Amino acid sequence: GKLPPVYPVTVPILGHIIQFGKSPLGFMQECKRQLKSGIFTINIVGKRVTIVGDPHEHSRFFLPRNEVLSPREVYSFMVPVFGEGVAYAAPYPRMREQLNFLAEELTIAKFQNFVPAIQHEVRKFMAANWDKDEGEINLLEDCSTMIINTACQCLFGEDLRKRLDARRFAQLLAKMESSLIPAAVFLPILLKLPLPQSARCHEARTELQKILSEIIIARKEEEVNKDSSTSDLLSGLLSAVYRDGTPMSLHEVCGMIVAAMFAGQHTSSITTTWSMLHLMHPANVKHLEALRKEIEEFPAQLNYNNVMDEMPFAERCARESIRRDPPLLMLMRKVMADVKVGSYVVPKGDIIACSPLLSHHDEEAFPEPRRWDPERDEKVEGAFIGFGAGVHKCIGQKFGLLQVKTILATAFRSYDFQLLRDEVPDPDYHTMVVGPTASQCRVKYIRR
Numbered sequence: 001g002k003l004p005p006v007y008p009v010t011v012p013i014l015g016h017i018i019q020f021g022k023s024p025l026g027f028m029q030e031c032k033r034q035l036k037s038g039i040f041t042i043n044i045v046g047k048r049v050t051i052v053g054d055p056h057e058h059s060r061f062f063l064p065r066n067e068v069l070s071p072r073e074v075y076s077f078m079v080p081v082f083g084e085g086v087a088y089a090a091p092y093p094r095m096r097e098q099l100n101f102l103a104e105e106l107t108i109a110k111f112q113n114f115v116p117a118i119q120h121e122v123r124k125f126m127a128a129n130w131d132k133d134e135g136e137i138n139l140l141e142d143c144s145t146m147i148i149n150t151a152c153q154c155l156f157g158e159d160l161r162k163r164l165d166a167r168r169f170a171q172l173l174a175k176m177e178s179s180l181i182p183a184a185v186f187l188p189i190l191l192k193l194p195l196p197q198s199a200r201c202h203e204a205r206t207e208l209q210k211i212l213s214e215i216i217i218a219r220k221e222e223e224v225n226k227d228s229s230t231s232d233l234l235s236g237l238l239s240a241v242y243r244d245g246t247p248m249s250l251h252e253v254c255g256m257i258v259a260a261m262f263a264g265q266h267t268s269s270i271t272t273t274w275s276m277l278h279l280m281h282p283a284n285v286k287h288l289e290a291l292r293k294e295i296e297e298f299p300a301q302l303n304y305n306n307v308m309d310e311m312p313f314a315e316r317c318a319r320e321s322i323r324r325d326p327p328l329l330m331l332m333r334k335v336m337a338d339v340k341v342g343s344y345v346v347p348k349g350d351i352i353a354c355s356p357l358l359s360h361h362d363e364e365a366f367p368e369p370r371r372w373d374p375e376r377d378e379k380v381e382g383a384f385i386g387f388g389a390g391v392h393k394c395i396g397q398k399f400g401l402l403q404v405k406t407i408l409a410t411a412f413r414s415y416d417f418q419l420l421r422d423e424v425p426d427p428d429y430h431t432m433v434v435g436p437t438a439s440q441c442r443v444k445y446i447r448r
């Protein structure tokens with residue numbers, strides 16, 4: 001039919017990957033300018049990637065059903081992490097049941113207990129590691145540690161955290177993470193080759209499943225000897241029954257737990273770090289005042305109402321941090337059948353993408369897009385896609401923001417911070433999940 005315009009390939013069989021790596025946004029905006037089109041196709045190692053780079057057409061990426069646009073093939077490289085029959089490795093109907101089960105473990109009703117759990121871990125961390133009148137820290141490392149500790153304290157019973165503490169859990173997860181080859185998205189041959197990565201991933205997942213098995217057995221013993229019963233994400237998923245009457249296997253529960261941590265860890269840490277970096281910069285002193293005012297009448301011990309209902313401004317700070325520097329640069333689907341987008345047909349076999357980095361820098365949608373302004377609103381409806389939308393919208397958004405907001409309120413109640421450079425850090429685009437440049441994240445905390 002009428003295909004999107006294709007950016008010229010001048011270096012064959014790499015395509016535009018190299019140019020993309022150098023300046024993701026600059027490159028994408030150059031394609032947009034040159035091809036006179038928000039919808040255009042680039043070439044990544046010989047694979048056509050059609051970018052829906054016009055915010056007016058977002059719904060064409062986000063709304064079509066799975067039969068039409070499917071992320072499953074994109075996620076083939078993560079099958080060893082999730083496990084077979086888990087998440088994108090399951091038929092879509094089955095994945096949806098699993099997602100519902102996960103969301104039910106992050107229901108608003110469970111937030112009643114999450115708030116104190118999170119604040120407990122935050123205080124404990126600050127008391128241990130931020131103990132002088134002032135001191136120097138790497139904010140990105142400290143927020144990452146807080147997020148693993150807080151997520152674990154919400155989601156895992158004490159017995160589990162004893163057998164599998166944050167530190168050990170992070171090691172297992174990092175071993176799985178460092179075994180991933182996202183290049184396999186564009187070079188699918190990799191997924192059929194024998195790779196040492198495969199054995200490491202399996203080692204770590206099996207080790208984790210073993211620990212969970214031993215926790216389940218121990219809990220059974222606790223219940224028999226005392227009436228002690230632990231209610232957590234583990235117990236919750238284990239009690240799940242699919243519509244076909246079968247229960248979730250331990251294999252599936254393990255994969256879901258792993259998948260949840262993989263989703264939640266970096267994104268939440270990065271969002272918290274950016275938010276603090278912005279709030280502490282002198283240019284944003286008005287915003288820091290608005291935050292401090294928002295939390296001023298909060299009890300020493302926050303509760304569900306405080307964080308959920310009484311923090312709209314902290315929430316704006318979080319979303320605008322994601323809006324300016326989205327941790328996920330490119331959302332992708334396999335085109336399963338020709339799809340009409342704007343004035344073009346995107347053909348079966350393409351990878352279709354929608355880029356939060358590109359869309360969040362559209363100047364009609366977000367005037368002066370490099371300026372962090374929590375008071376802004378999108379000027380094109382649906383242009384903010386920080387948490388995705390439609391069929392595959394984020395199910396962790398509320399829990400992620402609960403942690404970010406709780407950490408912001410707890411940190412800024414007791415500390416000020418000073419950046420150790422003139423400007424907030426540059427984003428570092430070399431990672432799967434993009435955050436501020438780590439070596440630029442050293443800051444000074446100052447006890448209030």
Ligand code: HEM
Pocket residue numbers: 071099260261263264265267268271322327328331332385386387388389391392393394395396397399400401
């Ligand atoms: C906290 C900051 C977070 C950001 C910025 C974020 C961002 C996103 C984005 C952009 C998508 C869309 C993916 C796509 O369209 O391909 C997404 C989907 C998803 N997110 Fe997150 N997320 C965050 C937190 C979390 C947490 C804490 C969890 C789990 C506890 C989570 C679980 C998921 C799941 C399961 C999907 C896929 C839903 C589906 O495929 O139907 N999110 N999120």
Ligand SMILES: O=C(N[C@@H](Cn1ccnc1)c1ccc(-c2ccc(F)cc2)cc1F)c1ccc(-c2nnc(-c3ccccc3)o2)cc1
Pocket residue numbers: 086087088095098099182185256259260262263264267328329330394396432433
């Ligand atoms: O982190 C990834 N996926 C995460 C995204 N996430 C994080 C928070 N919410 C959603 C992810 C998504 C869904 C799930 C998940 C899905 C289903 C389920 F039942 C449970 C969990 C788990 C995840 F870890 C991820 C990131 C990058 C990539 C990627 N592969 N290639 C690129 C790429 C290519 C070209 C240019 C730039 C990036 O990026 C693939 C996966």
